Amino acid sequence: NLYQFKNMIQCTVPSRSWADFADYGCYCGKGGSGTPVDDLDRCCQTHDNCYNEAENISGCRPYFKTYSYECTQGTLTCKGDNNACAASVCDCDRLAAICFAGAPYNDANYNIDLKARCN
């Protein structure tokens, strides 16, 4: 669920508030359209498409589904007690948190005008 994804980000990018990732580029947060503006936006586009795929599983709601995971000693793991929806969303989230840790963050790309720039 979004609270757990927020905690995965806190566990992989400790030197930055998770809100930094909430409204970035064309895909991070609200946005879901146009040309991703940079590497971090590309992380967010793959994450958004990942959710869209998970949503094809009956009864699977990625923003709300609680899954089982651990974040300890620099390692993030999705655990084996997850059902098919929980495992998929857990993987979408984990994949995105690891992506965010490797991508450069460009202040200029925070809170861009999605209506003008993400067509």
């Binding site: 669920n1 895909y27 609200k30 967010c44 958004d48």
Partner: peptide, 8 residues
């Protein structure tokens, strides 16, 4: 959470 927000 309750509220929001990202990504999709």
């Amino acid at each position: 959470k309750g509220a929001i927000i990202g990504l999709m």
